[PDB]
Amino acid sequence: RPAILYALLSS
Amino acid sequence: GEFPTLISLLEVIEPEVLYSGYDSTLPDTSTRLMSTLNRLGGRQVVSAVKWAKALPGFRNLHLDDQMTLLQYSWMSLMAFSLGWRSYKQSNGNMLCFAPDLVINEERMQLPYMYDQCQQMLKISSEFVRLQVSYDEYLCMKVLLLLSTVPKDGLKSQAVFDEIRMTYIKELGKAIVKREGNSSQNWQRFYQLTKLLDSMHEMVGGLLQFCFYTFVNKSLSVEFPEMLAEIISNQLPKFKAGSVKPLLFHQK
Ligand SMILES: C[C@@H]1C[C@@H]2[C@@H]3CCC4=CC(=O)C=C[C@]4(C)C3=CC[C@]2(C)[C@@]1(O)C(=O)CO
Numbered sequence: 001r002p003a004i005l006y007a008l009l010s011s
Numbered sequence: 012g013e014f015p016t017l018i019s020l021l022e023v024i025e026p027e028v029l030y031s032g033y034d035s036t037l038p039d040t041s042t043r044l045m046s047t048l049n050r051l052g053g054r055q056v057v058s059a060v061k062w063a064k065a066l067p068g069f070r071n072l073h074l075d076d077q078m079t080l081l082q083y084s085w086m087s088l089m090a091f092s093l094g095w096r097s098y099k100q101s102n103g104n105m106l107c108f109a110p111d112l113v114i115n116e117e118r119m120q121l122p123y124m125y126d127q128c129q130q131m132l133k134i135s136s137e138f139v140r141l142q143v144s145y146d147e148y149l150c151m152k153v154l155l156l157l158s159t160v161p162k163d164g165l166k167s168q169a170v171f172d173e174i175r176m177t178y179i180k181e182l183g184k185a186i187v188k189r190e191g192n193s194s195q196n197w198q199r200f201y202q203l204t205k206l207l208d209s210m211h212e213m214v215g216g217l218l219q220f221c222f223y224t225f226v227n228k229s230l231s232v233e234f235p236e237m238l239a240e241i242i243s244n245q246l247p248k249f250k251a252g253s254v255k256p257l258l259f260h261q262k
Contacts, residue, residue: 002082002240008060009077 053235
């Protein structure tokens with residue numbers, strides 16, 4: 001759900 | 012193995028300290044101070060994500076578990092790190108949020124600042140009392156990332172259990188390095204895992220005030236998008252009672 005966090009973890 | 016050692020990896024992936032850019036030309040206000048601290052905090056959390064991705068084992072977790080652990084533990088990580096910086100810079104006498112943003116006894120007197128700073132100082136005072144080493148601190152900080160979980164468990168529970176065991180053993184190695192006897196080593200492990208357990212209560216109060224400030228915007232304090240996204244997800248889970256701390260000692 002949290003977009004910035006997911007974008008970071010997706011590399 | 013020993014080339015590289017896990018503890019040397021933890022030392023090299025630790026992020027550099029960020030600066031706040033705070034403008035102290037004119038007097039403080041609680042609104043502009045808290046908004047500055049939230050903006051710094053969002054940047055620190057981004058650094059914490061990069062750190063977690065670099066932690067051996069973390070990326071073996073399901074992506075949803077990685078998201079959950081960082082969302083549940085971010086305040087513990089940030090408060091613990093603040094405690095370390097305040098220990099090294101002032102022996103816990105002041106709160107060193109950034110090298111250009113140090114909160115002394117007078118800034119704590121600002122409205123709504125005192126109680127939260129008192130809780131943060133308590134963390135720093137524990138590093139002083141226990142004479143925590145850098146390597147003990149680094150291992151303990153990993154364990155905080157792994158200390159707050161959903162009551163319904165994680166998707167990759169078996170991976171998570173093994174990661175936690177690895178870094179518990181690594182904290183043990185950091186203790187043994189201090190060259191005490193086996194009895195002293197077990198006592199110190201008891202003391203440090205008790206400190207880890209106490210973080211849940213010490214950080215729970217910080218989260219409640221954070222949640223309150225986020226929801227009701229008392230004094231209209233700003234949050235960066237990074238924290239607003241995390242808090243918006245974390246708060247309902249915490250409110251529903253769906254989160255549990257993992258404790259080393261029975262409460
Ligand atoms: C009551 C809370 C505590 C929160 C934290 C405490 C830990 C921390 C360490 C840092 O060095 C930089 C930023 C943070 C993450 C910080 C900033 C402000 C806070 C969110 C808070 O004061 C608000 O909620 C204001 O709105």
